[PDB]
Design a protein around this ligand. Structure first.
Ligand code: NI
Length: 431
């Protein structure tokens, strides 16, 4: 598309906004930028020629724009943007700008959880095939930074926020992994359903009806699931295989990923790669080489028959449910739950907490809430380190120590990554 002579305003000076700045500069267009923060750190990176307004949105600039490029996020709800729409001013996001300029097929992935694992893994399948692939979007580099005439395939992770502002995506294959929001619930689902519009192939979760396109399944749909679907899992005394269209394709022992959820992520990835035309042999190869992302049901230690699992990326009840459903534990599960639950209903976790082989170690702001799930088997401490010092002397060969806390880490940590890193350090110290 041609932006010459347009009055362009970018909202947001994070890396995504800066990518949009670079995008217009490269096309001879000097956009205006604004950010509600007083000193966003992107400031220091702007060219001198770019007019900037910070500390709030500038209504006059928005109302004078020919195009508003909105960084994705709660900012999309700001009443000044809504006023700009009412005046007929075009509003788009970086993903729309990208789709207009992309000169290679797009694989598009959204979902409440599993999206980064799946996006990365489809990336690795393309790399295994020798395909010049650009991987990013809502994870890694923002999408505009991936644009390159040499690119043969793009694999994008997309948020609901990004999809709200995207009208030009025609993915070669797209998925909603699952659906577990500023604009309300219907809006959240509706936004994800945008990903299927003009997608050649839709990869749906057989286990989550909300991932099905609006009007139902259609001829474009390929499913992945635990017990059934085009891509599913098959389990026979001691062994689990990925199964595709009726055929086992890989024993999971050949994969580095562990856990039912990552296996379904592997299936969804395979299905997207198969739909994108990637060769099957190299995509299987990638399944055997891919280590997994840190903090995503990641095995950080396995000594003396005890596996220590960092699932710190589980910051909500849906993520933890996904970690708990189909969990395989020979001996006792030692489950660490805690942090800032953000007023969540934890009860869905309770289904998974019966039997004689579960111990709970609860901590952080809402530790009390979490222990109340089954007080009989719960301890409560202030910190995860304290909880880990309680369980460590109790573990026995056969056990699993799982950090899947169902809460945000911000009461005690900088982010879920620091929480997982500390968990790994302590596991190594104690285990
Ligand atoms: Ni050892």
């Amino acid at each position: 598309a041609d932006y010459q002579g347009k009055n362009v305003v970018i909202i947001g000076l994070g890396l995504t906004g800066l990518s949009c700045v670079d995008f217009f500069l490269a096309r001879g267009v000097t956009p205006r930028v604004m950010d509600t923060r007083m000193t966003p750190p992107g400031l220091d990176k702007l060219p001198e020629a770019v007019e900037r307004h910070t500390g709030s949105l500038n209504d006059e600039w928005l109302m004078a724009a020919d195009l508003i490029v909105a960084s994705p996020g709660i900012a999309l709800a700001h009443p000044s943007l809504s006023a700009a729409a009412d005046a007929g001013i075009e509003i788009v996001g970086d993903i729309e700008l990208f789709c207009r300029e992309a000169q290679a097929p797009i694989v598009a992935i959204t979902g409440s959880n599993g999206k980064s694992t799946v996006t990365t893994l489809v990336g690795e399948m393309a790399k295994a095939a020798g395909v010049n692939v650009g991987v990013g979007g809502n994870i890694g580099l923002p999408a505009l930074m991936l644009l390159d005439d040499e690119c043969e395939l793009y694999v994008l992770e997309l948020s609901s926020f990004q999809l709200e502002t995207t009208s030009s995506l025609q993915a070669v294959a797209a998925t909603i992994l699952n659906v577990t929001y500023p604009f309300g619930l219907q809006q959240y689902r509706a936004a994800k359903l945008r990903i299927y519009e003009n997608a050649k192939v839709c990869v749906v979760n057989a286990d989550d009806a909300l991932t099905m396109p609006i009007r139902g399944a259609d001829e474009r749909c390929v499913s992945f699931g635990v017990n059934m679907g085009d891509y599913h899992l098959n389990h026979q005394q001691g062994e689990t295989w990925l199964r595709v269209k009726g055929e086992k394709v890989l024993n999971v022992k050949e994969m580095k990923l562990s856990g039912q959820h990552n296996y379904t992520n592997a299936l969804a990835a395979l299905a997207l790669a198969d739909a994108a035309g990637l060769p099957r042999a190299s995509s299987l190869k990638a399944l055997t080489t891919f280590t997994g992302l840190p903090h995503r049901f990641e095995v950080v230690l396995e000594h003396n028959g005890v596996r220590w699992i960092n699932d710190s990326k589980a910051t909500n009840v849906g993520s933890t449910e996904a970690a708990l459903n189909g969990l395989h534990v020979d001996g006792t599960l030692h489950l660490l739950l805690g942090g800032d639950g953000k007023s969540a209903d934890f009860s869905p976790l309770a289904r998974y907490l019966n039997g004689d082989n579960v111990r709970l170690y609860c901590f952080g702001r809402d530790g009390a809430q979490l222990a109340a799930l089954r007080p009989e088997v719960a301890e409560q401490t202030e910190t995860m380190e304290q909880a880990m010092r309680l369980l460590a002397p109790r573990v026995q060969p056969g056990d699993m120590v799982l950090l899947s806390p169902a809460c945000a880490s911000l009461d005690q940590f900088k982010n879920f990554e620091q929480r997982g890193n500390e968990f790994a350090r302590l596991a190594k110290e104690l285990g």
